[PDB]
Amino acid sequence: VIVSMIAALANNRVIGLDNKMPWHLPAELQLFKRATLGKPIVMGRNTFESIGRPLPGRLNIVLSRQTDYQPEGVTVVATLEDAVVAAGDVEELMIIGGATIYNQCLAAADRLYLTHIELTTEGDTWFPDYEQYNWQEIEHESYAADDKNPHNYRFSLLERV
Numbered sequence: 775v776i777v778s779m780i781a782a783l784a785n786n787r788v789i790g791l792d793n794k795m796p797w798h799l800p801a802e803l804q805l806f807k808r809a810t811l812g813k814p815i816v817m818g819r820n821t822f823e824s825i826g827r828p829l830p831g832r833l834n835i836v837l838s839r840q841t842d843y844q845p846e847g848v849t850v851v852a853t854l855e856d857a858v859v860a861a862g863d864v865e866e867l868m869i870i871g872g873a874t875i876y877n878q879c880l881a882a883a884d885r886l887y888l889t890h891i892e893l894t895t896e897g898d899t900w901f902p903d904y905e906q907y908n909w910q911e912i913e914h915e916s917y918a919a920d921d922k923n924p925h926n927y928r929f930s931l932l933e934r935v
C-alpha cells in the first residue's frame with residue numbers, strides 16, 4: 775500500500791491552533807475531500823475530535839492508545855502497524871494527520887498531498903520539516919483567493935525520491 779500524507783500548511787508550516795484550523799477555505803476542504811474520498815484515512819485522536827465526526831465515504835481509522843476509546847462510526851487502532859492492517863487490501867492509504875502522526879510517518883511517506891496557504895498565522899501544531907528529504911512535484915495547481923476563499927493557496931503533489 776502507498777503511504778500518502780495530506781495537509782494544508784500556512785507559512786512556517788502551521789496547520790493548527792487550539793485543536794482547530796487557523797483559517798477557513800471551503801474550496802480547499804473540498805480539495806481534501808476530493809483527494810481522500812473512497813480511501814482509508816488515518817488520523818490521530820486529536821484530529822478526529824477536531825473534525826467532530828467520521829468523514830463520509832471513507833474508512834475512518836483513528837489512532838489512540840486509550841484502550842477504551844471508541845467513538846461511533848470509526849475504527850480505533852493502538853499502533854501505526856495496526857492502522858495499516860486496518861486500511862486493508864487497498865492501493866493507497868491517506869494519513870490525514872495531526873502533527874503527531876505526520877511526524878511519525880514522514881520518513882515512510884511515499885507521497886505528500888500539500889496545499890500551501892499564503893498566510894502567516896499563530897499556531898500550536900506544525901507540519902514536519904519534509905524538505906529535509908528529497909521530493910519531486912508530480913502535480914500542482916494555484917488557486918487565487920476569491921469570493922468564498924479569502925486566501926491564495928497552491929496544491930502540490932510530491933513523490934518521495
Ligand SMILES: NC(=O)c1ccc[n+]([C@@H]2O[C@H](COP(=O)([O-])OP(=O)(O)OC[C@H]3O[C@@H](n4cnc5c(N)ncnc54)[C@H](OP(=O)(O)O)[C@@H]3O)[C@@H](O)[C@H]2O)c1
Pocket residue numbers: 780781782783788789790791792793794795817818819820821822824837838839840843851852853854870871872873874875876878899
Ligand atoms: N491543516 C491541516 O492540514 C491539519 C490536518 C490535521 C490536523 N490539523 C490540526 O493539528 C492539530 C491536531 O494534531 P495534534 O498532533 O495535536 O494531534 P494528533 O496528531 O491528531 O493526535 C495525537 C494523539 O493521537 C494518538 N497517537 C499518536 N500517535 C500514536 C501512536 N503511534 N499510536 C497510538 N496512538 C497514537 C494519541 O492520543 P491518545 O492519548 O488517545 O493515545 C496522541 O495524543 C489540530 O489543531 C488539528 O486541527 C491540521
Ligand SMILES: Nc1nc(=O)c2nc(CNc3ccc(C(=O)N[C@@H](CCC(=O)O)C(=O)O)cc3)cnc2[nH]1
Pocket residue numbers: 780781782795802803804805806807821824825829830870871888889
Ligand atoms: N489539504 C488539507 N486541508 C485541510 O483542511 C485538512 N484538514 C485536516 C483535518 N481537519 C479537517 C477538518 C474538517 C474536515 C471536513 O469537514 N472535511 C469534509 C469536507 C468539508 C465539509 O464537509 O464541511 C470532508 O468530507 O472531507 C476535514 C479535515 C487534515 N488534512 C487537511 N488537508
